[PDB]
Design an enzyme around this catalytic site. Structure first.
Site, PDB file in Angstrom:
ATOM      1  N   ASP A 158       2.577  50.877 -48.735  1.00 22.16           N
ATOM      2  CA  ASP A 158       1.597  50.022 -48.753  1.00 22.16           C
ATOM      3  C   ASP A 158       1.498  49.905 -47.121  1.00 22.16           C
ATOM      4  OD1 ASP A 158      -0.568  48.278 -49.322  1.00 22.16           O
ATOM      5  OD2 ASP A 158       0.717  46.604 -49.917  1.00 22.16           O
TER       6      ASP A 158
ATOM      7  N   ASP B 122       4.701  44.472 -47.269  1.00 26.18           N
ATOM      8  CA  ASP B 122       4.754  43.441 -46.311  1.00 26.18           C
ATOM      9  C   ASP B 122       4.707  42.088 -46.988  1.00 26.18           C
ATOM     10  OD1 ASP B 122       2.142  42.989 -46.809  1.00 26.18           O
ATOM     11  OD2 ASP B 122       1.574  43.211 -44.623  1.00 26.18           O
TER      12      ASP B 122
END
Length: 249
Positions: free
Chosen positions: A33, A202
C-alpha cells in the site's frame, strides 16, 4: 538466551502471536500500500498559484487542522515568510476540506476537482501536492528472484502518479484510484485464486484490507493508535529489515 520475542524487538519488529512465524514460510505474493511504505508518511507542496494574501488566508485556516495535508500547507506558507492570522467559526471534515472566517470574508480549502482556495464563493488560488519516495530497492530486486515472489502495488492515488512510481521501482503490476473497500476487494480475488498474501500498510484507509491478508505488517510512525491490529509492527519503520526477514526463508 532471549525469548524469540525479545530477539525480534531487538531487530525492530513487534510480533503478535507466533502463529506468524510459520505462516510467512508459505507466502507467494507481497503487496505494498504505497502511502507510508514506499513513501514517507509526509506530503509536500510542489506548486502554488495565486497572490501572497490568498496564501496567508489559506494557511491561517489549515492551522486549526491536524491533517497531514493541512500541516504541509502551513509549513510551506511559513517558509515563504507569511504570518498566521485570526480565524473564526472554524469547521472541519477530514480529507475533504476546511472552512473559517477572516476580515469578514468566508474562506475555504477543498479538493475534488489537488487543492483549491475559495474566498466568498470565488475560486482564487490552488495547491499542488505530492509525497517523497524513500530510498532503497535492492531488497526489491532480491525478493523478485528470491522464492520468485510476485510483487504488487496498490493505491488511492491517481493513475499517472502510481505509474511513475512503478517505473522507478521497476514493478509491472499496479492498481490506482482505489477506495478502502476496493482494496478489500482485490485481496479477496487473490485468496480465492489460491494465493498466499503478505501486505504492508500504514493503517489509514486500509485496516480492513490488512485484517484480510494472510499476514499483515503495520508501520509504527503511522499513528497506529487503534490500528494495533496487525501480525507485525515495524516499530523502527525500517522496511529493509522485513524485506530482510522475508529473505530468510
Amino acid at each position: 538466551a532471549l525469548s524469540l520475542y525479545e530477539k525480534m524487538l531487538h531487530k525492530g519488529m513487534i510480533i503478535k502471536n507466533s502463529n506468524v512465524y510459520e505462516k510467512i514460510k508459505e507466502i507467494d505474493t507481497i503487496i505494498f500500500d504505497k502511502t507510508g511504505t514506499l513513501t514517507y508518511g509526509t506530503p509536500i507542496v510542489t506548486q502554488f498559484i495565486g497572490d501572497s494574501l490568498s496564501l496567508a488566508y489559506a494557511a491561517s485556516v489549515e492551522a486549526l487542522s491536524s491533517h497531514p495535508i493541512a500541516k504541509a500547507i502551513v509549513k510551506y506558507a511559513k517558509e515563504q515568510g507569511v504570518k498566521i492570522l485570526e480565524v473564526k467559526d472554524f469547521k472541519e471534515i477530514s480529507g475533504i476540506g476546511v472552512r473559517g472566517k477572516i476580515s469578514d470574508k468566508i474562506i475555504e480549502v477543498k479538493k475534488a476537482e489537488d487543492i483549491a482556495v475559495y474566498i466568498n464563493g470565488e475560486p482564487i488560488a490552488s495547491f499542488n501536492i505530492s509525497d517523497v519516495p524513500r530510498p532503497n530497492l535492492k531488497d526489491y530486486l532480491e525478493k523478485l528472484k528470491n522464492e520468485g515472489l510476485k510483487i504488487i502495488i496498490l493505491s488511492g492515488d491517481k493513475e499517472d502518479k502510481v505509474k511513475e512510481l512503478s517505473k522507478e521501482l521497476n514493478i509491472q503490476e499496479y492498481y490506482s484510484n482505489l477506495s478502502p473497500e476496493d482494496k478489500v476487494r482485490i485481496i479477496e480475488k487473490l485468496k480465492q485464486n489460491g494465493n498466499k498474501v503478505l501486505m504492508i500498510g500504514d493503517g489509514v484507509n486500509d485496516a480492513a484490507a490488512l485484517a484480510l491478508a494472510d499476514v499483515s505488517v503495520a508501520m509504527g510512525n503511522g499513528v497506529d493508535i487503534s490500528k494495533n491490529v496487525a501480525d507485525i509492527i515495524l516499530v523502527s519503520n525500517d522496511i529493509g529489515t522485513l524485506l530482510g526477514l522475508i529473505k530468510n526463508r
